[PDB]
Structures are given as structure tokens and as C-alpha cells.
Design a protein around this ligand. Structure first.
Ligand SMILES: Nc1ncnc2c1ncn2[C@@H]1O[C@H](CSCC[C@H](N)C(=O)O)[C@@H](O)[C@H]1O
Ligand SMILES: Nc1ncnc2c1ncn2[C@@H]1O[C@H](CSCC[C@H](N)C(=O)O)[C@@H](O)[C@H]1O
Ligand SMILES: O=C1c2cccc(O)c2C(=O)c2c(O)cc(O)cc21
Ligand SMILES: O=C1c2cccc(O)c2C(=O)c2c(O)cc(O)cc21
Ligand code: NA
Lengths: 319, 319
């Protein structure tokens, strides 16, 4: 039934995971039709059992079937690329750590100790745990790098970066955003702040080991905070924006860039942020409220359109 | 996007699991509208975070929102009952053992050792593992009991059981099917064969500790095999049906009752049977082939409509 297939929603994720995580999807490059008999002889995958998985992937719209051959749908071409954002997403989505986090989600709703379902499962908050787990950190940092690489073109389009001199990306991870911005917008100073046990190295990039809960360094006229506040509570979000106000002078600008909560789109991500971080996906007005509480003023707001979600672009300056 | 929410299908199952497994859903009996403010004060669940879960359950069509209150949808009334088949289904669906089995699914497609993804994860085949695991066994045996209870009325309706004298249910589990049949069809000999470390006890039911891979006891004129063959390969399925033909005389009947593979319905269950058992959901034609290889003939074929899935009713006799 529709109700039992809704209960069995996990089977869709798990089917895609088996298809992608094995690298079987990498045989479906450039919308080529694949003979499963040939793929079975080549890769050693069981013909009959993989044929049944392919049938389920057709039902899901991941594959298209014609004359007993299978190609990836136009929309799912990304699964042929193991470096794609979608490839890293599914590898994390149903990994043992996320699964065990979800199994503590119910119990976490009855606790007021400020411990996420992830922390209740694993004994540390998400980012602290990633320090001791390379599988989670490498895949998570790689996903953030891919979505950073996707948005850069449209971000340069809507805001003049040439007016600025000194640019700091706060929680910039591997620093892919500013590496890409520096290629187009040259002659500037570029710095990336994150939690680094070993500093990354890149041409024209000053990598800083820091903690945006404690302080943000002053002496930059442009600050960037992309996909950070979704990982934090309202009070921790205010504390971060307060550290920005303390760091910023009258001619400083902060670009607050996040996936925005539209009524039209799914709440599934909002729940994942609760499970992993005790975070949430916020609306424009919710972001504006946090900024005003921290002593920051909205100078301009824009919407950036990305394939997977709309983004909220919010320019902030001090009162 | 539609692709990223398809990747994130597991989030639907996990959200439902949190709502049902905690017993929060049992506050929504008889389609009543629930004040979440009051439920939070009563149960101690966090208001703001559970409100966000409820908004996701509305999006899924599990809850309906009116007058700043929430009720279960007509179809999802079953979630209010912790005794319901649907409640046992979601408890198993994303449990750690199923999750770890799914994470071995991809790797299992490249092996030819006859080890299910479940066995690769846990070190024993499903039913042998359940012998040592009270959570898995109790919940699985409970699920099978509920679906056995649901079908019995329609099963008695489409087949005359009064013509028979000695009835054996092979792999009959807790024995729910024959217990309910014996209440309506009186003055018969009733036997249930399964794997029992301790024999169940029930008025006028002969419980047998057996192995249908080894032998089926002779001297019964009616045999029942319901939701068994989906747990077995083609060769193991033939072996079971061969053991039936050796046990059956010319006057004997075997009722082969299974959820049937119809092109209209989802292939998700077929894949789950691969992961847990190296089994499969089969069509009428596929069942007929196996029966013919075992030396049995299809005399009667009917379809039984159940809420969650259509059932194939196949009456077999020896050649
Ligand atoms: N206390 C802290 N100080 C600095 N960075 C932190 C931090 N806690 C978490 N982070 C970083 O915050 C980032 C959240 S993910 C966002 C990465 C990047 N801005 C992008 O949009 O792609 C991670 O890189 C994480 O390491
Ligand atoms: N080798 C074996 N011999 C006998 N029963 C077996 C078996 N292997 C598995 N079983 C049993 O087969 C059943 C499969 S589930 C089916 C239960 C019941 N017929 C129903 O439809 O509700 C379980 O009860 C399991 O314990
Ligand atoms: O896919 C994302 C993602 C995509 C775009 C923007 C994002 O911020 C995220 C994000 O934060 C995230 C996450 O925190 C944990 C995940 O398992 C997956 C994702
Ligand atoms: O829900 C079912 C189910 C329903 C009806 C008839 C069934 O046979 C089953 C079944 O076999 C099964 C299973 O083997 C493992 C599960 O996690 C769930 C189910
Ligand atoms: Na009203």
C-alpha cells in the first residue's frame, strides 16, 4: 500500500546506496545504455540479483529501461560521477553513524540536556566526533566542498566582491568557496577560518585555526558565514553573530548564506539538523531576528536558486 | 529537489519510527485532535522540537493540522495501536540489524557463497540469528501473527476447509492462522510445524519442532505454506516443494499463499527479501515453474485482496 511503502521509504535510500557506494553507477556515464549480462561478466556482480535492483531503480526513476538495457535518467546523471555532491550525500545519509543517531531521535525529544540524538548515540557532539572519525569528516568536508563549488558562479553574479579588500570565510571548511572567488576576483587578501589540527595550504589563502564560538578576528571588511547557523541553536547562533559584531567596524559587511525554509519545500532537512546538531533550517525573518538580537542590521536580502534548494543571501552590518 | 528528497527517503521512515517507537502516536487514538502544548506538559516531550516533527508528519500525510491541533489521518489510525502490524513493521524496518544488513547489500551482490547481506553483517542466516535475539524474534513473530490474523476471514471465504480432516500449517510460526481457522472450522486435527526451542501450547493444536528443508510429515490431506517461499532461493524453494510431494498422497492438497509480484505494485519488498534471506517476491508463473520442477500441479489459482498487498492463493496436488 501507499502507507506501507511510506513506512518502507528507507528501502529507496538503501537501494541507491548499494548502486552508488559499490561504484556500479560509474558504468552509466554519459547516458549510455548498459547490458547487465555484460556488466555481470565484467564486474562479477550477480546478474539476476542486480537485474532485480535495476528494476527497483527504474520504479524510483533513477534508471530508464529500453530493450532489456538500463541508462541513468537525465536528472540522475550525477550518480555516474563519484566526485558529485549527490554521491557523498547518499554515502553519509544511511551510514551506521547517521542510522544510530536516528534511532536516538525519539528518545532525544524527552531530554532537555542539550545533547543531540547524534551525541546520545556516539558520546560527542557531531564536529568533535568528526575529529576522531576520518570516514565522517572526509565525506562531510567533501560534500560541503561540492555544494560550495556549485553556488560560487551565482554568488559572484548577485554581489560585487571587487569593492572589498580583506575577505574572511568563517567556518569555510577546506576553503573551496574563497579558492574559487580568488580565481575570478584577484588582488585581494583571502583568509579561511575553521577547526584545523593541521592547516591546509593553498596559493593566496591564509588558513586560520579558530573557534567562532569564542571570537572572530577583526580587520576584515568582508565576512562570509555559509551553511554554519543550520548546525547551531538560536542562542549559539546569536553568540556567533555577537562575535561578528565585536569583530566588525562601521565599513565591515557580513554575508549570511544558508538554505532557506520555504513552505513549498520538504521539512526533512530541518529534522536532520535537529538529529545531528540540535540545529534547524530557518526562514528569512527567523535569520533577521537572530541578527537584530546580536546587534546587526539587514542592509539587503536576495534569494539564490540552486538545483536541490533555494538559498537565502543576507548582507549584515553593525547598528 | 525531487532527487535529493529521494536520496533522503530514509528520513520519512526515521521520522515515523520516532513518533511510533516512543509511543507518542498512542495519544492519537480514535482520530482525536491533540494539543501538542498539552501533550508536551503531560508526556514531557520538548514542545518546539516535537512541533517540528509534527509539521514533517503533516507533509507526509501521517497527521492532519486543524485548530492548532493534530490528528492521525484516516489511513494512519493504525499508528495509534501498538498491537497493529504497521507498528511492528516500522520497529523492524530501520532497527540497527536491518540497517547493518542494508550496508552489506552492495557487497553481497559480488559474492557467490550463498550468504545474505544479513548473514554477512551478523554472522548467521536470519532465522538462526533470531534464536539468540529476543528483540528481532518477538517483533518478527508478532508481525507474522498480525498479518495471519488479518487474512484468515477472506481465506475461509474463498476455500472450503470443512472437506478436510487433518490440516498441517508448515512454517506456521506462533500458529495464529490455524488457531483462528480452528475456532470457525471445528472437529478437525490441527498441527503447526516450525523451529521451536520450546513448543508453544494451544487447545487442540499439535505443535511440531521440524525442518521443512529435511522432511514434511505425511498423513495430512491439507498442507498450508504461507509467506515461507519468499524467504528462500529457487533451489531451496524446489527442495521444500519436493519434500511436500514426498509427504502428499493423491488426495492431499497444498495451499501455497504468498504476497504476489504484480507489475502495478512496488519492488521494494522483493529487494528486502534479497537483503534478509537471499529470497524474492514471485509471480503466479514463477511459483508454477517451481511447483512443476518439484512434481506438483496447479489445480486452483485465486487472488486475495489485503490492505497492504494482493495475495496469490495457489492450490497444488501431486502429478
Ligand atoms: N567552533 C567552530 N569554529 C570554527 N569552525 C567551526 C566550528 N564548529 C564547526 N565549524 C565548521 O563549520 C563548518 C560547517 S559546514 C559549512 C562549510 C562551508 N562554510 C560550506 O558552506 O561549504 C565545518 O567546516 C566545521 O568544521
Ligand atoms: N527450516 C525451517 N523449518 C521450519 N520452519 C522454518 C524454517 N526456517 C524458517 N522457518 C519458519 O518459517 C516462518 C517464516 S514467516 C511465516 C510465518 C507464518 N507462516 C505466517 O504467514 O504468518 C517463520 O515462522 C520461521 O521460523
Ligand atoms: O547534503 C547536505 C547539505 C547540502 C547542502 C547544504 C548543506 O548545508 C548540507 C548539509 O549541511 C548537510 C549536512 O549537514 C549533513 C548531511 O548529511 C547532508 C548535508
Ligand atoms: O511486513 C512484512 C510482511 C508483511 C506481510 C507479509 C510478509 O511475509 C511480510 C514479511 O515477510 C516481512 C519480512 O519478512 C520482514 C519485514 O521487515 C517485514 C515483513
Ligand atoms: Na479553528
Amino acid at each position: 500500500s501507499m502507507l506501507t511503502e511510506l513506512i518502507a521509504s528507507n528501502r529507496r535510500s538503501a537501494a541507491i546506496h548499494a548502486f552508488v557506494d559499490t561504484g556500479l553507477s560509474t558504468h552509466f556515464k554519459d547516458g549510455i545504455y548498459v547490458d547487465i549480462s555484460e556488466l555481470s561478466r565484467k564486474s562479477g556482480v550477480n546478474y539476476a540479483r542486480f537485474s532485480r535492483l535495476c528494476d527497483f531503480l527504474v520504479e524510483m526513476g533513477v534508471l530508464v529501461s529500453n530493450d532489456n538495457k538500463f541508462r541513468l535518467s537525465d536528472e540522475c546523471h550525477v550518480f555516474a560521477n563519484p566526485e558529485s555532491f549527490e554521491s557523498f550525500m547518499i554515502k553519509l545519509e544511511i551510514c551506521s553513524h547517521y542510522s544510530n543517531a536516528w534511532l536516538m531521535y525519539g528518545k532525544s525529544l524527552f531530554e532537555d540536556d542539550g545533547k543531540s540524538a547524534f551525541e546520545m548515540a556516539h558520546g560527542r557532539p557531531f564536529f568533535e566526533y568528526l575529529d576522531g572519525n576520518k570516514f565522517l569528516k572526509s565525506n562531510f568536508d567533501a560534500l560541503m566542498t561540492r555544494v560550495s563549488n556549485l553556488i560560487v558562479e551565482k554568488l559572484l553574479g548577485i554581489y560585487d566582491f571587487n569593492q572589498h579588500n580583506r575577505i574572511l570565510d568563517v567556518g569555510g571548511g577546506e576553503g573551496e568557496l574563497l579558492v574559487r572567488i580568488s580565481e575570478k576576483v584577484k588582488g585581494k587578501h583571502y583568509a579561511v577560518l575553521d577547526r584545523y589540527s593541521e592547516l591546509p595550504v593553498s596559493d593566496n589563502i591564509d588558513f586560520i585555526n579558530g573557534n567562532f564560538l569564542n571570537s572572530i578576528p577583526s580587520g576584515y571588511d568582508l565576512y562570509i558565514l555559509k551553511n554554519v547557523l543550520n548546525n547551531w541553536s538560536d542562542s549559539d547562533s546569536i553568540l556567533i553573530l555577537e562575535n561578528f559584531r565585536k569583530a566588525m567596524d562601521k565599513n565591515s559587511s557580513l554575508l549570511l548564506i544558508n538554505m532557506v525554509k520555504e513552505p513549498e519545500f520538504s521539512r526533512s532537512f530541518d529534522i536532520l539538523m535537529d538529529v545531528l546538531f540540535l540545529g534547524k533550517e530557518r526562514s528569512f525573518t527567523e535569520f533577521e531576528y537572530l541578527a537584530n538580537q546580536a546587534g546587526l542590521v539587514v542592509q539587503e536580502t536576495k534569494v539564490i536558486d540552486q538545483s536541490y534548494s533555494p538559498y537565502s543571501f543576507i548582507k549584515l552590518q553593525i547598528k
